[PDB]
Design an enzyme around this catalytic site. Sequence first.
Site, PDB file in Angstrom:
ATOM      1  N   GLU A 184       0.810  -1.223   0.000  1.00 35.15           N
ATOM      2  CA  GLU A 184       0.000   0.000   0.000  1.00 35.15           C
ATOM      3  C   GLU A 184       0.841   1.269   0.000  1.00 35.15           C
ATOM      4  OE1 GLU A 184      -3.151  -0.279   2.927  1.00 35.15           O
ATOM      5  OE2 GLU A 184      -4.201  -1.718   1.537  1.00 35.15           O
ATOM      6  N   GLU A 205      -4.356  -9.167  -0.981  1.00 37.10           N
ATOM      7  CA  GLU A 205      -4.733  -8.917   0.426  1.00 37.10           C
ATOM      8  C   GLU A 205      -6.199  -8.565   0.553  1.00 37.10           C
ATOM      9  OE1 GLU A 205      -2.386  -6.116   3.336  1.00 37.10           O
ATOM     10  OE2 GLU A 205      -4.499  -5.618   3.799  1.00 37.10           O
ATOM     11  N   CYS A 228      -9.427  -8.656   3.859  1.00 42.66           N
ATOM     12  CA  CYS A 228     -10.123  -9.125   5.091  1.00 42.66           C
ATOM     13  C   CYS A 228     -11.361  -8.280   5.261  1.00 42.66           C
ATOM     14  CB  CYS A 228      -9.282  -8.984   6.357  1.00 42.66           C
ATOM     15  SG  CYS A 228      -8.758  -7.265   6.643  1.00 42.66           S
ATOM     16  N   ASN A 261     -13.151 -11.054  -9.458  1.00 43.38           N
ATOM     17  CA  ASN A 261     -11.756 -11.003  -9.843  1.00 43.38           C
ATOM     18  C   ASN A 261     -11.402 -11.994 -10.968  1.00 43.38           C
ATOM     19  OD1 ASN A 261      -9.618  -9.732  -7.264  1.00 43.38           O
ATOM     20  ND2 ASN A 261     -11.792  -9.287  -7.450  1.00 43.38           N
TER      21      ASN A 261
HETATM   22  C1  LIG Z   1      -7.893   6.201   4.272  1.00 41.43           C
HETATM   23  C2  LIG Z   1      -8.490   5.031   3.462  1.00 41.43           C
HETATM   24  C3  LIG Z   1      -8.909   3.911   4.432  1.00 41.43           C
HETATM   25  C4  LIG Z   1      -9.605   2.713   3.743  1.00 41.43           C
HETATM   26  C5  LIG Z   1      -8.944   1.370   4.164  1.00 41.43           C
HETATM   27  C6  LIG Z   1      -7.430   1.387   3.863  1.00 41.43           C
HETATM   28  C7  LIG Z   1      -6.990   0.080   3.184  1.00 41.43           C
HETATM   29  C8  LIG Z   1      -6.414  -0.864   4.225  1.00 41.43           C
HETATM   30  N1  LIG Z   1      -7.382  -1.502   5.168  1.00 41.43           N
HETATM   31  C9  LIG Z   1      -6.878  -2.524   5.798  1.00 41.43           C
HETATM   32  S1  LIG Z   1      -7.787  -3.466   6.934  1.00 41.43           S
HETATM   33  C10 LIG Z   1      -6.395  -4.361   7.663  1.00 41.43           C
HETATM   34  C11 LIG Z   1      -5.306  -4.216   6.562  1.00 41.43           C
HETATM   35  C12 LIG Z   1      -4.038  -3.919   7.302  1.00 41.43           C
HETATM   36  O1  LIG Z   1      -3.937  -4.788   8.460  1.00 41.43           O
HETATM   37  C13 LIG Z   1      -2.901  -4.080   6.337  1.00 41.43           C
HETATM   38  O2  LIG Z   1      -1.712  -3.805   7.035  1.00 41.43           O
HETATM   39  C14 LIG Z   1      -2.996  -2.999   5.237  1.00 41.43           C
HETATM   40  O3  LIG Z   1      -2.263  -3.442   4.119  1.00 41.43           O
HETATM   41  C15 LIG Z   1      -4.445  -2.588   4.799  1.00 41.43           C
HETATM   42  O4  LIG Z   1      -4.484  -1.173   4.995  1.00 41.43           O
HETATM   43  N2  LIG Z   1      -5.565  -3.051   5.645  1.00 41.43           N
END
Ligand SMILES: CCCCCCCC/N=C1/SC[C@@H]2[C@@H](O)[C@H](O)[C@@H](O)[C@H](O)N12
EC number: 3.2.1.45
Length: 496
Positions: free
Chosen positions: A234, A339, A341, A369
């Site tokens: 990310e 990734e 969840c 997908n």
């Molecule tokens: C500001 C925008 C927020 C929307 C959500 C951001 C995307 C990530 N959400 C999650 S929910 C849980 C996972 C993280 O644990 C992982 O480390 C990340 O790669 C990832 O961010 N992630």
Amino acid sequence: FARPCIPKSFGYSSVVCVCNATYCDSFDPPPALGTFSRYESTRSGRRMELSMGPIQANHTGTGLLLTLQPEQKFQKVKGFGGAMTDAAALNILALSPPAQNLLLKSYFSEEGIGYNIIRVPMASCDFSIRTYTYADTPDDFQLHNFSLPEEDTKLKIPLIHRALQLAQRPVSLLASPWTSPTWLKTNGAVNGKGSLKGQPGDIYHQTWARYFVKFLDAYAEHKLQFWAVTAENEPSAGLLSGYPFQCLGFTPEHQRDFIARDLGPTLANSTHHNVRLLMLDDQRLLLPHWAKVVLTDPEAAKYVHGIAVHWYLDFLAPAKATLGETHRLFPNTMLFASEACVGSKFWEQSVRLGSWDRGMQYSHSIITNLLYHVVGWTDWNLALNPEGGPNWVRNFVDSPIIVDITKDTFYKQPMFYHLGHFSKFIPEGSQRVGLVASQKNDLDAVALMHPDGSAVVVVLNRSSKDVPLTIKDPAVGFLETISPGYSIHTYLWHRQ
Ligand SMILES: CCCCCCCC/N=C1/SC[C@@H]2[C@@H](O)[C@H](O)[C@@H](O)[C@H](O)N12
Ligand SMILES: *[C@@H]1O[C@H](CO)[C@@H](O[C@@H]2O[C@H](CO)[C@@H](O[C@@H]3O[C@H](CO)[C@@H](O)[C@H](O)[C@@H]3O)[C@H](O)[C@H]2NC(C)=O)[C@H](O[C@@H]2O[C@@H](C)[C@@H](O)[C@@H](O)[C@@H]2O)[C@H]1NC(C)=O
Ligand SMILES: [K+]
């Protein structure tokens, strides 16, 4: 030996399957021409249950017909898995050893669901209980003090070895970094807005690129090889002011020049030149813009094997405009889902034991997908506790397996089976083929061909209504079936 699911409700829409030190659900040992096999899971409680039916020579009526187009060939599947985070590892090892074996078997064994991908973070992420990199000694541009700590050598690496021994299928490892050492960063911290100091091609960037090679070295010393690494988990996170846990920000131009000047060449000149590089590792709404910025520069393009996507902002990104358009422009660069969840939104419960809805989100994402050229799909943490952790910033989420330490018990959630409906039955090298519907319908369905030429079709019913249907395979025959409300089926047959 097949052992049914021990169900237990926690008040959500469906049950979990209870496993412990001496018992876990499993399958019998593995059809026959002119018959098909059906695996079924339902909100009502069936869990990958096996049935058979005949393939019929003719068919009549005006119900929904699904027709394989086996000559319409799309992408080859790389496969399916989950991530061995520090949290997953601590949770798995919290069980007694016989329960650990059954948990690993559930994922990695042919008597489980046959995962063939594991994602491994390079050092600490939010799913860690301490903040570390592999080179925390300041200004060590030469990386003499690069070291794997016990999180890797006593926890992750021995668990990955055991997952490899259980699997019959070859298992591919994928690595991703969250942050660099803080002394390579503009803000001098593991989190927050901040990127690598200086500019691609300089000493900070060459050091960061050598860190990947050092990582691959240390793991290879422990007899683990990588299929692929991502250039950064990310990368847009680190553009975001106050970003609360480990990250390292790159604009797409920044990623382009880093891969072209530092990361690409450094990997190609190492003993690890066969490890694939994946770019993006981010929301699909960044597509096709990021693919354009990076892959129209022939110096970065020559190193990028594929593009990794996360599912989190999918609701802002229709698949055709992002995945579809990217495949159209760059069909030779594979799309891979790295990734996913549920439970991560501020206002959702992190863990909802027995949620069928969450199961459906997995399979709907996986089928969508596959329908848009993606070659593989990787869940996030392989197991979590009943809070959705541990997690040093409390960014708790859900997992297909929830571990209850004090009961030496683990729960397989609907998500586990929605994933199994694909991972178990779609080996690496399977190829997605055409499938068309006779009328508008509410089903999600996808058809693939196994390496041996046999067929697999996954049918997800996200509505409450039973949809009777037929599947047509040209010159073998017709399968008459029904897709009950809130069900997922996998069909298998030899075309032989
Ligand atoms: C500001 C925008 C927020 C929307 C959500 C951001 C995307 C990530 N959400 C999650 S929910 C849980 C996972 C993280 O644990 C992982 O480390 C990340 O790669 C990832 O961010 N992630
Ligand atoms: C791990 O999980 C397994 C499978 O769930 C446990 O095994 C089982 O225990 C059940 C309840 O304790 C057994 O059930 C009963 O039988 C009678 C009729 O014969 C019923 O009236 C009664 O109400 C129950 O349904 C069940 O038969 C058994 N399941 C299987 C397939 O083995 C296991 O439990 C432990 O071992 C068993 C053999 C018993 O001695 C239990 O008391 C004991 O908890 C689980 N292990 C642990 C530590 O919980
Ligand atoms: K939450």
